[PDB]
Amino acid sequence: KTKMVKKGVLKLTKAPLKIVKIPSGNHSLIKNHESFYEMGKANFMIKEI
Amino acid sequence: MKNFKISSTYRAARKQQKTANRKSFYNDEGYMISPSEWADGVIKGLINPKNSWSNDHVKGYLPRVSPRSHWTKNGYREYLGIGKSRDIPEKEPEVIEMMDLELVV
Amino acid sequence: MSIITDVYAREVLDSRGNPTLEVEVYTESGAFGRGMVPSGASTGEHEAVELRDGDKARYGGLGTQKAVDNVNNVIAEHIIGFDVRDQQGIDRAMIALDGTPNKGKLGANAILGVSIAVARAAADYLEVPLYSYLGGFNTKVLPTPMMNIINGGSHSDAPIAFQEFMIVPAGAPTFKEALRWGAEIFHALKKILKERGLETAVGDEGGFAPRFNGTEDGVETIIKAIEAAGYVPGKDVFIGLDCASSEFYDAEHKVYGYTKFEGEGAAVRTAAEQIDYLEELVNKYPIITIEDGMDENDWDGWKALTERLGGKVQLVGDDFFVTNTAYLEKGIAEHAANSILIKVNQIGTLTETFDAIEMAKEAGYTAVVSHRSGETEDSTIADIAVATNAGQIKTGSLSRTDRIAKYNQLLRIEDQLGEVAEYRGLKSFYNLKK
Amino acid sequence: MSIITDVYAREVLDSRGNPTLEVEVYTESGAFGRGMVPSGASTGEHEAVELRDGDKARYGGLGTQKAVDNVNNVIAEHIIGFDVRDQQGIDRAMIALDGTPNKGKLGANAILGVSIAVARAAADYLEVPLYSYLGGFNTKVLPTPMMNIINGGSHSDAPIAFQEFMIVPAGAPTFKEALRWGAEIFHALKKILKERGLETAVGDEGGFAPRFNGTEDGVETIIKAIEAAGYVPGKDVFIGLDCASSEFYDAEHKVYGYTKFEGEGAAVRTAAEQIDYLEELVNKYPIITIEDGMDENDWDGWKALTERLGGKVQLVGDDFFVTNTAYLEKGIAEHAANSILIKVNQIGTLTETFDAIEMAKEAGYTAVVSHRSGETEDSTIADIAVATNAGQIKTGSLSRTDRIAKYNQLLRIEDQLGEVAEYRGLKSFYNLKK
Amino acid sequence: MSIITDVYAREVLDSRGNPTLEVEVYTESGAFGRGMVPSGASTGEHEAVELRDGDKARYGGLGTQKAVDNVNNVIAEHIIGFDVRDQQGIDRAMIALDGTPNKGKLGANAILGVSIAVARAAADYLEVPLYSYLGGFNTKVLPTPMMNIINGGSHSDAPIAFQEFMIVPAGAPTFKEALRWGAEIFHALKKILKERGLETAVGDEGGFAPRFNGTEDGVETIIKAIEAAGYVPGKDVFIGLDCASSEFYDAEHKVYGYTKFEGEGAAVRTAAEQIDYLEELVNKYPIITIEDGMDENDWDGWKALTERLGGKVQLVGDDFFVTNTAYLEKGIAEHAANSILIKVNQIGTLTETFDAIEMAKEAGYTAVVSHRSGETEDSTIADIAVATNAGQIKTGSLSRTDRIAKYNQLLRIEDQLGEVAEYRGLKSFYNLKK
Amino acid sequence: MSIITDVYAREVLDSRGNPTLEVEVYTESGAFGRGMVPSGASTGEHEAVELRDGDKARYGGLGTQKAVDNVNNVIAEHIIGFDVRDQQGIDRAMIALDGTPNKGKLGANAILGVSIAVARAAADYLEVPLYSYLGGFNTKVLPTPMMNIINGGSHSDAPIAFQEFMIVPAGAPTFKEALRWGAEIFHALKKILKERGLETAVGDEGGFAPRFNGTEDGVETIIKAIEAAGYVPGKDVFIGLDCASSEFYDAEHKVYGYTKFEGEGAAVRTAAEQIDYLEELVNKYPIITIEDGMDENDWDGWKALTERLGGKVQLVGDDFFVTNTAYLEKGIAEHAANSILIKVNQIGTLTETFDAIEMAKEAGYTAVVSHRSGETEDSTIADIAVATNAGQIKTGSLSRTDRIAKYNQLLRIEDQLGEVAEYRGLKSFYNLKK
Amino acid sequence: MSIITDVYAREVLDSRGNPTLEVEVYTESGAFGRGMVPSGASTGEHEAVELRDGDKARYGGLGTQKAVDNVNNVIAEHIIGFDVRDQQGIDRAMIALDGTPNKGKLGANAILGVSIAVARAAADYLEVPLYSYLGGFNTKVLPTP
């Protein structure tokens, strides 16, 4: 009944907007004003300790 | 669902793409079943007749839904959700200090 | 605009006081259709069966709440969203949804009611007459009626084996004149029976059931009524019979036992004795139609009857075929009968009804649209008869509104057609020579 | 848009084989209305007369081509251009165009057909049900039916002087239940008459006319059928009578001679003895209605009968008032009867019918909307009974579509009304105490 | 397009400067309806109670912001989505939403305002007059007005116990002539009062409240003014009384004490003495209506008064019945009064108002549609009076547009009805004899 | 769709029981407008005159059938076919068809009724509010009401020469609060007069006319009523006078005779003594408005009054200007008054009313839209006041719907405008310094 | 059918060859209005200021891309859904959305363009002349030039 149509739908949870301070300045985590985070997304940095 | 209604373009698309002539039926576990077994389950009570069928698929990425209107106190028309959308700017955001962060080009 | 938005059934009463159902179809633009189902038979080996409640507390087990629920909860979900003019698609969808050959799960009455309501709603939406919608632009022939005037068999206490006797006003110029002649013969027979001291009250189809001496006496008094009305038997008005010999047929002895209805001393006739008895009746009286003159399972007797009398007398298979395409195909292959009695609820769908009519017409057979014992105010069979240009109808006597409704609808159709309308009379018996 | 564009009459057949007429009304926007006329009486001192051809060579002098021509060539040219919602204006214009107290110039059948067709076309234009258009927004009361079940007098050969007997299912919760009770009692009575060997064929109203021993035999068989169906007489189902005492009333001797129907041994009663007989019948059986208990011209007898029995039994004037405002007002002045039988074709228009209903309601009388002997597939009297909230209907038995059509229309009206639908039963008899 | 999409309420002022509320309803297609609520009472054991703010700082506790908030926030969400022509369904839904027999939760004023607004929006949507929508096609009777001319009791400082005196121009040929007669008698009485040196300023209802000597002097001056205008008392114009006997009834002593309003040597009359006084007044003067001639709880006195004066004088129960269905049932059963004063805000719903009107009509009682002390520019009660064909209205004097609005609405209705319009006059008192 | 199709006038009663006329305008798309005319004067040297029948046997010679015939048989033929939005063209055509400068041939009432009906039908056709149609998009200022609270002069038997006294709640934040304050002050004054033993029954404009000891006593009672309500005189609520000084002005001796109304002991003041009397009344009390302080023909006294008191108080010319453009222009030329009382029926059309309002605005004068003595349920002057942003209205007291209807329409306009609605209050007196 | 569904601004040229902006308003039924803004002064003490790009690489710093973006991205989503005949409400909503006494945030030119376009589309929807819509029925005086 819950048929996957075409390539499916995008998973977007809701969570509070957060600004970050980086060398480039002020960065918004999401580009929308409806407070929609791409669920499951993360970033990483890997070093050679 | 009161703020919006079905768009006329999507209704016309569904009407003369005949998507309602090609319904798919499901049992209580949401599995595709033939119309005969769907009728047999609905008659027996093992299937809810309301939420157990689909109206095929309409092609072309048409907007399914358009804003609904109502009458203001002076007899003018107005979108239902335009004026009660929000009242406060939700305060926010929080500026987290993360100067120590190696960015990637 | 033409999209079906509401399909709703409710339980109503038929002409006998027994429950039936009616279906209302509403489309998006407001076009409305209402189909009322005649009462048929809930049990049948090779006929479509109607779904009855079986609850002895309500209506003696004859309630139709189950079929109404099947329409409202099962058929309505499938059919809402269809185009109202997609009669064949809706009918095939209902047939597939039922899934059984005899339509016993949904109920043939439910499917037929939805079919008729959809057809009427489509005709309303297109703003065309129902016969125009069903049969196209070339719908002009007004059917020749078989007016049931005398009842016997299982419908009477009289010693008459034959179930029905009918008058066929095939000599009239128009359908209006034919209806007038039938009404006048009906009233003349009423006066003759009152003078004779016999019972005058009417039965299920509006016909009389007096205490005659036999079949011959009934035919002679019908001829006397015709002559009293001022019409020539055999030229203006003819006689038809519905023997229903399956009621008084001994299957194990293979003999048509007339003693069931005509007392102990009645003659017991075998197959060939029935054949030449019917031939003697045809030679004695102006008989143009004989219906169910053989048992529904006497195929060899039916073939012998068609060989003997099929060239000059119309032989109708009511119970022989039961509006079944397979049985009609078999009868065409074996040259059994030359006419089929078409009952809409015996097959349960307008598409299949028109398929049977077309198959009968292609073989040189005549299709006779027929009424049921329990009818309604719905007069769709008149529109079916005009739409198919069948040229013959059998919708009862000139007494009850369950029968007069179809005659009034045919009068309206004739008035609408105007100068285009044709009443062919004897030329509508194209299954007969000359 | 609502301006009347076409008015067309044609001749159709009623529920007896006799001709009547139907009228179709078309407005500019395509709104359509059809009104069929029940057959009445062309002879009457102060009742509206219908126009018959009188040509003995056509339908035995009962053709209605004169009234059809009156609509097509006189009324149509006068009504076309009116707004379809001007029912009072159209009816007044037709009454003035006739210019005759009993509507003999144009025929009351023609005028009634145009009135019904215009009202139905106006309801079709406004997309409202007919009862909503006729009676307003506050139309909720489903009538209590008096289902005729046994015949006598001139409708039977049995020695029963009373014209007919009715069952009143005034203890039912809904109209659906009352209809089911009436149908089950009808079938139980049919089974009882089959066991006793009495006749089963129905009459004009759909009711049986068996060869009972007398009035008490018929009433006792009715009670037996009620109890066999599973209902309590006097609490669930009551009994009404239509004596039609004008048939067996000797005007010169001022006596009610039952010998006209009950044989040479019948009792010849005066007015006081007739009132005593009716009172003892009321005390013996659960009788809630007596119709035409006295003669149409015996005003002293009617006054005495109302003084004696008017507190506990309903006394209906059928031939007493003949749907006449003058006669009804005269009866209200002298306390004669407490109910009037409202026949829509006995007065001529819908405006005058509603005026009679409202006058009876204002006087504390009950208005009982009634059928005719020759009915049609038209079911407007059901909408009249619901629209006026009359609470009582007399639309025949449970055996013919001329009667079952009104019951099916009442079922449909109850279904659309839904939760606001009211079946009062015994509280519909507001002309009685407790 | 007929679906209710917007329900707004706001606080406005009545004819006395006290707050009330008005409601506006918009449907999907733009049909608009506005209902204005008359000022009633928030107290009463068995009457519908209005909702007030109770904030003594705002309007002395008489604000209606709570009811306006109830309409905007509670009723509007429940009612939006209904069909505007589903007046009975909307009214039943709002009654269920209140959940209280006297409508104390949402407020009777709020419920009545939404009822009137819905009815007017439905009439606007159907493009029909309001009386046609409310009462159907048979709405022709223009009510006979009992208009206040002279006041007393608690509305005046004169020694007159009776609250109101009215003129009833029941001999007028049309309603237009009746209105002219009433206005001319009003002006002639104004001239007579100016000549006598009495006061001319009008009260709440628009009538004079001069300092007379007693009841007899007031009625004598009214008759003198009627003759001065040029009309015969007792043939053209009649007198009517609103005693309001509850205000000067001592419950402890079971006596009618005229000393409360008529001075110190005023007569003190029991129930029988009160009946004798009223009968003497009726014999002396052309009094045709008496309203609240007994206490609201003096059922034995009411029954005796209806026994004595009920055949010739209309006896209206205002505080007696409080337009309550149960009290009207008890009064009809106990033969108390023969007329009921119908106030639409003492019930709170048009459906129940019409139910009470037809229930009173079925018993031979007359429903007199009445105004309140604090009225508005809304004139729906005139359309109610025409729609039910009640034939009696009591809408005030000829000196303020809270009454002239209803009089002008009746003039407009009579103009719209044309030749159909009827002014029964003296015939509208069908609760009397001859 | 906007073409005028029907213009129809009828005769209806006004607020005083005297006849007047109302016009209905229908366009071909169904747009509807209704204009109801207040009662003005049928005489006057330089004022538009209304048409009365003059037949003393009908309404005392005050009928309006002649002007109804003028609308139906003369005006309607010229106007039908015009565009409904061409208000200026229709009004100019009516003025030209009339011919006379005082609108005497057709009647000013007929012309005004057609003008208002056309304007309302054009507002209905465009689906815009009437004030938006009349004044455009920039229509937001709610007028500062001047409620007449005490009467005098020819309206009272008290020894007060001033015709009336007003409360002006110019300190309110909103119009809703201003109306609430006016209602509370009215009720407090009612309580004060009840405790003092003075009269309470209201007059023509809904205000009290008690038997005060003099003008100072009346102003003191009003100020104590303001203080009892809980408001500060001179900051929240102000006083106003309408002296109607032409009534007690003796043109023979060029003196203002207060002995006409205040008794023989009153002082007779010349023009300068009347000046000092008005000036001392202004210094003693918080009076912001004086209307008709001098005679209609005392131009030198009017100039002196504007020179001395015209800087701080508002001087309104009611009979001085009689809404005449010529007199208003002359008064602007020589600085006579600083305000004009606009009466729409005093000039004849809406075009000329708006012309006079704009001319008054251009010279710094204040235009006050005023009610007539005989008002109707029509509330067009509220829309006129809002449309022109006049900032002041004079529509009587808080006690009769002839007056409350205008306040209710102003409440509706304020609620429809919502946030954009403005209440200037003291800022509306833009003709005064600071 | 009178509800504003599209508000779109574009950059055009004025008399002097300097940039300005124009605004088009479309309602549901197809009523159209186009308002073009006169060139004013971007600097002022107690006068409404217009919005200029300030980029000397384009039009000498007189480009009106910032006001066009303000109309297309800010005002358009605020105004769509209003009745086109609600001129006062739309103007008050725009003034509140700017939040600056000199209207320097959105730009006075942008606000004026939307105001004129809304008035013209409302006149087109009501099928009346613009002066009739703005000033009511009593508009007759031709100005002295």
Curated annotation (Swiss-Prot), chain A:
Instruction: Report what the protein is called.
Output: CRISPR system Cms protein Csm5
The miscellaneous comment for this protein is:
Encoded in a type III-A CRISPR locus.
* Origin: domain of life: Bacteria
Which part of the entire protein is covered? 307 to 355 of 357
Recorded source organism is Streptococcus thermophilus
Say what the protein does. CRISPR (clustered regularly interspaced short palindromic repeat) is an adaptive immune system that provides protection against mobile genetic elements (viruses, transposable elements and conjugative plasmids). CRISPR clusters contain spacers, sequences complementary to antecedent mobile elements, and target invading nucleic acids. CRISPR clusters are transcribed and processed into CRISPR RNA (crRNA). Csm functions as a non-specific ssDNase. Base-pairing between crRNA and target RNA to form a ternary Csm complex activates a ssDNase activity; target RNA cleavage suppresses the ssDNase, a temporal control that prevents uncontrolled DNA degradation. Viral RNA transcripts probably tether the Csm complex to the viral genome, recruiting Cas10 ssDNA activity which is able to degrade DNA in the transcription bubble, spatially controlling the DNase activity.
Q: How does it assemble?
A: Part of the Csm effector complex that includes at least Cas10(1), Csm2(3), Csm3(5), Csm4(1), Csm5(1) and mature crRNA. The Csm complex is elongated and slightly twisted with a maximal length of 215 Angstroms and a diameter of 75-80 Angstroms. It has been modeled to have a central protein filamant of Csm3 subunits along which the dsRNA helix of paired crRNA and target RNA binds. The filament is capped at one end by Cas10 and Csm4 and at the other end by Csm5; ssDNA is thought to bind to the N-terminal HD domain of Cas10.
Query: What is stated as this protein's family in its record?
Result: Belongs to the CRISPR-associated Csm5 family.
UniProtKB/Swiss-Prot annotation, chains C, D, E, F:
Quote the record's binding site residues for (2R)-2-phosphoglycerate. Answer: Q163, K343, R372, S373, K394
Give a GO molecular function annotation for the protein.
phosphopyruvate hydratase activity
Location in the cell reads: Cytoplasm; Secreted; Cell surface
Q: Where mainly located?
A: cytoplasm
Instruction: Please tell me one Gene Ontology term that the record gives under cellular component.
Output: phosphopyruvate hydratase complex
Reactions mediated catalytically: (2R)-2-phosphoglycerate = phosphoenolpyruvate + H2O
Cofactor(s) listed in the protein's UniProt record = Mg(2+)
Q: Quick one: which residues bind Mg(2+)? A: D242, E291, D318
Alphabetically ordered keywords of this record: Cytoplasm, Glycolysis, Lyase, Magnesium, Metal-binding, Secreted
Q: Tell me the active site.
A: E205 (proton donor), K343 (proton acceptor)
Question: Which pathway is it part of?
Answer: Carbohydrate degradation; glycolysis; pyruvate from D-glyceraldehyde 3-phosphate: step 4/5
Q: Could you say which EC number(s) this protein's record lists?
A: 4.2.1.11
CDD domains, sorted: enolase (cd03313)
Which GO BP annotation is one of this protein's? glycolytic process
Q: Name one Pfam family in it.
A: Enolase_C
* Record InterPro entries: Enolase, Enolase-like_C_sf, Enolase-like_N, Enolase_C, Enolase_CS, Enolase_N
Q: How is the cofactor bound?
A: Binds a second Mg(2+) ion via substrate during catalysis.
Name of the top EC class for this enzyme: lyase
Annotated function: Catalyzes the reversible conversion of 2-phosphoglycerate (2-PG) into phosphoenolpyruvate (PEP). It is essential for the degradation of carbohydrates via glycolysis.
Homology family: Belongs to the enolase family.
Protein name in the entry: Enolase
Origin organism is: Streptococcus thermophilus (strain ATCC BAA-491 / LMD-9)
Q: What is the lineage of its organism?
A: Bacteria, Bacillati, Bacillota, Bacilli, Lactobacillales
Q: Which gene encodes it?
A: eno
